[PDB]
Design a protein around this ligand. Sequence first.
Ligand SMILES: O=C(O)c1ccc(-c2nn(C(=O)c3c(Cl)cccc3C(F)(F)F)c3ccccc23)c(OCc2ccccc2)c1
Ligand SMILES: O=C(O)c1ccc(-c2nn(C(=O)c3c(Cl)cccc3C(F)(F)F)c3ccccc23)c(OCc2ccccc2)c1
Lengths: 262, 261
Amino acid sequence: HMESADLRALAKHLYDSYIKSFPLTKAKARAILTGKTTKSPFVIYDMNSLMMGEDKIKFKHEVAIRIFQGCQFRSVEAVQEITEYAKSIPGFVNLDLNDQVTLLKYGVHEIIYTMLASLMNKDGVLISEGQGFMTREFLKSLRKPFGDFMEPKFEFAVKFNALELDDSDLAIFIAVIILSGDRPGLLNVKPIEDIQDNLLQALELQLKLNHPESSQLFAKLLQKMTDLRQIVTEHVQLLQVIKKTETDMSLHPLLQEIYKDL
Amino acid sequence: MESADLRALAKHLYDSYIKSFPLTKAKARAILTGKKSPFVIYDMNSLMMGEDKIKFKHITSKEVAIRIFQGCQFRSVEAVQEITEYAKSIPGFVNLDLNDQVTLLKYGVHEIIYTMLASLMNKDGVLISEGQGFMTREFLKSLRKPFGDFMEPKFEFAVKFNALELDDSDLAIFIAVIILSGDRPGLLNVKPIEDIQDNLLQALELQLKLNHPESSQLFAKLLQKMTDLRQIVTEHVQLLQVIKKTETDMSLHPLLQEIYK
Ligand SMILES: O=C(O)c1ccc(-c2nn(C(=O)c3c(Cl)cccc3C(F)(F)F)c3ccccc23)c(OCc2ccccc2)c1
Ligand SMILES: O=C(O)c1ccc(-c2nn(C(=O)c3c(Cl)cccc3C(F)(F)F)c3ccccc23)c(OCc2ccccc2)c1
């Protein structure tokens, strides 16, 4: 339902808007993680280095709570960037306004975990626009339920990163996630699915041109949407334990609204 | 992988799918749409008459809601054996590590049962006993305590899944894809499983293009349903646990408890 040139044009549009919307790309994150440059992050691996990192790293946003609350504020910034990106997806702002809210409500976390994988390897995650690197072992060692928060994200990212996607692939994949016609409470499924159909055609052609030797990469990427859904559900149940255990811990109102009745 | 090889693989699976499963989607749709009218169970009195006249096996505690629930469990155990026989016809499956064969079936059967159950359902009810009976959605949803809300999610899934309008030749490949899932926990040799799934996916993609040329990106939409299947199977497990801990009248002969574990 779309010619090849139109699908290439749509792929280029989305990549361009992705570069404009997300300040830390996978390409930059990989150049920081693979090193070979003098761009080097400060590495936080224990309590003493955290204390030194806060002195050296210029953070834009008890140790476990401090790290948790900071993650929440980074997630809110991520929602803002994802929302800016979503408005560039052709057709999205023309949808019913309640459906725009619904698509963002259920899509933003799946996108956050997708894009978080770009900042991750098996040993830890880049933080503060790549200025810092916090080890997976240090996060797993946090007290109470906080230790178990990041480990599922690392588990996903190790598998997702084996697909070797780049930002130009990811730009379309993220659009596909937002324009999901199966979100609960949608009023007008038909125009959402028509946009997703074009996005899926564009993703399929993008993966064939950019990864010609990666057989059925399109199918394998769509199957990862299953892993994303699973970790979002785990995440929601994990916060509920914190809400009942940590009663003095505030959650950001934007995050409060997203998780409500999910 | 050439097109003729993919078509050969698609036809092999369709042929085996027909032999392994007692009621095809095509035959089920002919019964459901009214095109030997099945005996209809729509309340307690018709249930009792169905057990007396048709004598439905698996629906033979004296409480009705429990009896119907256990009957779903008993049919699902029968379905597992049909799925196991079908799996053996998938090229490459029996050549896998024997523990990996068991693991793929153990973790795949719930998703496959839900998928194939949809072939037997419409928005008003479900066929039972090889299409000889039809039990209404309202009767199942009206069962007491948690049993009623146990049945309704199955219908909600099936109504959405059936909107894709797959036929048996599509489903035969799709079921094979689910079985050859390389991400099941405890697999020892993932590589040959993903190599077989890659062939099956190529065969499903081509099958869907030739069989539904007007249904844009149906391949993508069907793979997106694997998300729904995983989600409802996880929900299913939690619902069973609540029933296991709450209900005291669910006891069977210990030998039957072992069979239908
Ligand atoms: O201030 C800052 O610039 C800043 C910046 C980042 C973090 C921080 N983010 N984060 C994430 O997962 C993450 C990331 Cl990388 C990128 C995008 C979206 C997300 C999230 F949406 F998924 F959230 C973490 C996971 C584990 C630990 C930290 C992060 C951050 O953490 C708070 C913190 C860090 C160190 C010391 C004290 C507090 C702070
Ligand atoms: O023919 C067939 O392929 C087939 C296949 C499935 C059912 C049937 N299973 N089922 C379940 O809950 C279920 C499911 Cl989805 C997946 C795994 C395990 C279970 C269960 F173990 F938990 F059971 C149902 C819930 C409601 C309605 C039907 C099912 C099935 O039901 C026939 C039936 C219906 C009512 C009374 C007696 C039999 C038939």
